[PDB]
Structure 1
């Protein structure tokens, strides 16, 4: 399960396969109840699968017509890769196509046209589906494909955040805090990152909640990156107020990628909607949590805070997590 926030979706499971198994069992029971020639059941099932395979072949050919224009750039200028991407596994698909053709051209069929007439009708139906866009994928299927294939912006944002910022500072954060304390308050030993699922992320944190105010600045860290010599990473130690008293101080910061998502939502070229913004923010939080859990650099040296504004007091949540 997920511990950051009850509103964070867990990874999709295998409920669809369970429902499919139940449906198959029910269909088999129904066919048994009907008590008609069983051979016909298998024959027509095979014919239907063959028709679907031929339709997939036609759709793949139509898609390949477009994909060929991009052979040189996208597909390394090789026709074999183009065919593989348009039709999948060439050999498996070819074997299935040959079986479908043979069975349909050979097996007697009472429901369905002969081979040539059936092929014409199938091509007609596939062309109509392509032209009218009648063949579309539901949002749930698209989301499942994206998550399974990791085709979501949040994945890239989280990996960028881990590889560009955390992976560098986190090992040296203990040393920097030690130096700051030895030279001078009694700050915590972990980095606290706030993850507003609403992606508000005000630039001036004190504006978000008066109870949090700036205290001091950690020593800067310098490192060479992307040709930019002496690139500087800096933190900011804040002080948390309870009834006007300094309850605790921590190295606190927000997640810039949430600002990026919010800005993308504001713009129009991005094609980014607010609902997509929320979904990608939740996915970003989940992915970052997983990466830090599996990461070696972060060994109880960083903590993440996730909250959703509904009455609301950021300072109270931060203090609650600190006192643990």
Structure 2
């Protein structure tokens, strides 16, 4: 279920990462010349492509999203793993070749799991079903996060769908728009 994946993304990740995020940003700024200085820059921006096309490297889908650095790692004992490592990446977003914004950015990994699952021989299901699962994942997550008062200021969910009708969509522009709000 998208249900289970949403509960998993909360319980196994956001729940653990959001409370410590700002301390990790303060440290990043101390080490990297106050690079994450704007208020728009102190959130985790999470990409939810409802089509579930999720590359591992962001430059594969948009040339204007450039890797810059990692936040300090977070270590937590988890399910018998001592110091399980939780990591996040800081990117610089270009506009017309100009550094236009800096933020912590990533995809919601479970959507990449739905993609792979939907295509497998036995596990598979239709694209229309995957779309509905992806939408349900976002909806179920948004429901969970209403009991998480901190989430509002530590993360931003960017949900979108790629056009297929000849209309242009720039992922970089969209991320910039959120950073700037």
With normalisation by structure 2, the TM-score equals: 0.91
How far 1:155 moved relative to its partner? 0.8
* Unaligned runs of at least 5 residues, structure 1: 1-152
Partner of 1:52: none
How far 1:228 moved relative to its partner? 1.0
Partner of 1:186: 36
Give the 3-state SS of the residue equivalent to 2:103 in structure 1. strand
Match of 1:209 among 44, 62, 74: 62
Moved over 2 A (4+): none
RMSD over aligned CA atoms reads: 1.1
Q: Which structure has more strand as a fraction of its residues?
A: 2
Match of 2:117 among 261, 264, 267: 264
Q: Which structure has more helix as a fraction of its residues?
A: 1
Query: Is 2:104 aligned against 1:251?
Result: yes
Match of 1:170 among 13, 18, 25: 18
Give the 3-state SS of the residue equivalent to 2:67 in structure 1. strand
CA distance in 2, matches of 1:299, 1:263: 30
Q: From the CA coordinates, give the structure whose radius of gyration is larger.
A: 1
Residues 7, 141 of structure 2: 8 Å contact kept: yes
How far 1:237 moved relative to its partner? 0.2
Give the 3-state SS of the residue equivalent to 1:260 in structure 2. helix
Match of 1:308 among 119, 140, 161: 161
Residues 167, 297 of structure 1: 8 Å contact kept: no
Query: Alignment length, in residue pairs?
Result: 172
> Following superposition of structure 1 onto structure 2, how do residues 71-90 of structure 1 map, counting pairs within 5 Å?
none
How far 1:297 moved relative to its partner? 4.1
Residues 209, 314 of structure 1: 8 Å contact kept: yes
Partner of 2:4: 156
How far 1:272 moved relative to its partner? 1.7
Partner of 1:219: 72
CA deviations over 1:42-91 (Å, ceiling 9, x no partner) = xxxxxxxxxxxxxxxxxxxxxxxxxxxxxxxxxxxxxxxxxxxxxxxxxx
CA distance in 2, matches of 1:168, 1:201: 23
CA distance in 1, matches of 2:16, 2:91: 21
Query: Is 2:84 aligned against 1:231?
Result: yes
How far 1:293 moved relative to its partner? 2.5
Give the 3-state SS of the residue equivalent to 2:151 in structure 1. coil
CA deviations over 1:214-265 (Å, ceiling 9, x no partner) = 0111100001111011100000000000011110010001011101100011
Residues 212, 238 of structure 1: 8 Å contact kept: yes
Residues 193, 304 of structure 1: 8 Å contact kept: yes
Give the 3-state SS of the residue equivalent to 1:300 in structure 2. helix
Partner of 1:322: 179
How far 1:186 moved relative to its partner? 2.5
CA deviations over 1:11-32 (Å, ceiling 9, x no partner) = xxxxxxxxxxxxxxxxxxxxxx
With normalisation by structure 1, the TM-score equals: 0.52
Distance 1:206 1:179, change over 3 A: same
